Design an enzyme around this catalytic site. Structure first.
Site, PDB file in Angstrom:
ATOM      1  N   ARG A  92       0.884  -1.170   0.000  1.00 19.45           N
ATOM      2  CA  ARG A  92       0.000   0.000   0.000  1.00 19.45           C
ATOM      3  C   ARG A  92       0.925   1.224   0.000  1.00 19.45           C
ATOM      4  O   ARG A  92       2.068   1.095   0.431  1.00 19.45           O
ATOM      5  CB  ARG A  92      -0.913   0.034   1.213  1.00 19.45           C
ATOM      6  CG  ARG A  92      -0.253  -0.112   2.573  1.00 19.45           C
ATOM      7  CD  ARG A  92      -0.440  -1.523   3.129  1.00 19.45           C
ATOM      8  NE  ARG A  92      -0.145  -2.541   2.139  1.00 19.45           N
ATOM      9  CZ  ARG A  92      -0.829  -2.969   1.099  1.00 19.45           C
ATOM     10  NH1 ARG A  92      -2.019  -2.495   0.759  1.00 19.45           N
ATOM     11  NH2 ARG A  92      -0.308  -3.935   0.343  1.00 19.45           N
ATOM     12  N   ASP A  95       0.718   5.580   4.196  1.00 23.49           N
ATOM     13  CA  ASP A  95       0.674   5.142   5.586  1.00 23.49           C
ATOM     14  C   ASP A  95       0.318   6.306   6.510  1.00 23.49           C
ATOM     15  O   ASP A  95       1.002   7.325   6.546  1.00 23.49           O
ATOM     16  CB  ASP A  95       2.046   4.617   5.989  1.00 23.49           C
ATOM     17  CG  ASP A  95       2.100   3.760   7.224  1.00 23.49           C
ATOM     18  OD1 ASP A  95       1.077   3.382   7.836  1.00 23.49           O
ATOM     19  OD2 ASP A  95       3.255   3.424   7.580  1.00 23.49           O
ATOM     20  N   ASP A  97      -0.190   6.749  10.474  1.00 24.96           N
ATOM     21  CA  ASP A  97       0.003   6.108  11.767  1.00 24.96           C
ATOM     22  C   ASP A  97      -0.281   7.106  12.877  1.00 24.96           C
ATOM     23  O   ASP A  97       0.291   8.197  12.953  1.00 24.96           O
ATOM     24  CB  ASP A  97       1.438   5.584  11.857  1.00 24.96           C
ATOM     25  CG  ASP A  97       1.700   4.477  10.863  1.00 24.96           C
ATOM     26  OD1 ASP A  97       0.863   3.556  10.775  1.00 24.96           O
ATOM     27  OD2 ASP A  97       2.725   4.515  10.157  1.00 24.96           O
TER      28      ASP A  97
HETATM   29 MG   LIG Z   1       3.980   2.783   9.265  1.00 20.04          MG
HETATM   30 MG   LIG Z   2       0.744   2.030   9.433  1.00 21.14          MG
END
Ligand SMILES: [Mg+2]
Ligand SMILES: [Mg+2]
Ligand SMILES: [Cl-]
Length: 158
Positions: A92, A95, A97
């Site tokens: 993917r 990201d 987070d």
């Molecule tokens: Mg990450």
């Molecule tokens: Mg992540």
């Protein structure tokens, strides 16, 4: 509550994907962007010279529950991150987070806060230090001290 979110892109032209990501982050309900770091550059490993990663940090004021914020970051990853048109193997490309949520320590199957490897990731800590130089972790460690005592890769701005 202030949440700190890490953004990484290795997709296409990372400037455009990261900006869409920022727009989506601001569009989360009951939430607003307080500040955004500079964009940073992390080379890929090996000689292949695949796309570099673009890394950033955002401070997000939110009255959502942590797991609700996670629903939104997961959603944005699917909607903006490709993965329908190319998933595992890709990987993917976008990201998001959740690094920190307030002074909360969350340990659940879905969500661990602070992000479990963040104190060893310079591409997370340096952008975080740019927008939060006085940050202290829930365990009491100071961000400034970690940056003085742990070894990180050189991290240039984008
Ligand atoms: Mg990450
Ligand atoms: Mg992540
Ligand atoms: Cl901690």
């Amino acid at each position: 509550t202030v949440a700190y979110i890490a953004i990484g892109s290795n997709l296409a032209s990372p400037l455009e994907q990261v900006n869409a990501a920022l727009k989506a982050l601001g569009d989360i309900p009951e939430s607003h962007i307080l500040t955004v770091s500079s964009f940073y550059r992390t080379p890929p490993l090996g000689p292949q010279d695949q796309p570099d990663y673009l890394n950033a940090a955002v401070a997000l004021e939110t009255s959502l529950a942590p797991e609700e914020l996670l629903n939104h970051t997961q959603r944005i990853e699917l909607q903006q991150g490709r993965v329908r048109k190319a998933e595992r193997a890709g990987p993917r490309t976008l990201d998001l987070d959740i690094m920190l949520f307030g002074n909360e320590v969350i340990n659940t199957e879905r969500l661990t806060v602070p992000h479990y490897d963040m104190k060893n990731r310079g591409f997370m800590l340096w952008p975080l230090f740019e927008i939060a130089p006085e940050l202290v972790f829930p365990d009491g460690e100071m961000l400034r001290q970690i940056l003085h005592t742990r070894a990180f890769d050189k991290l240039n701005k984008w």
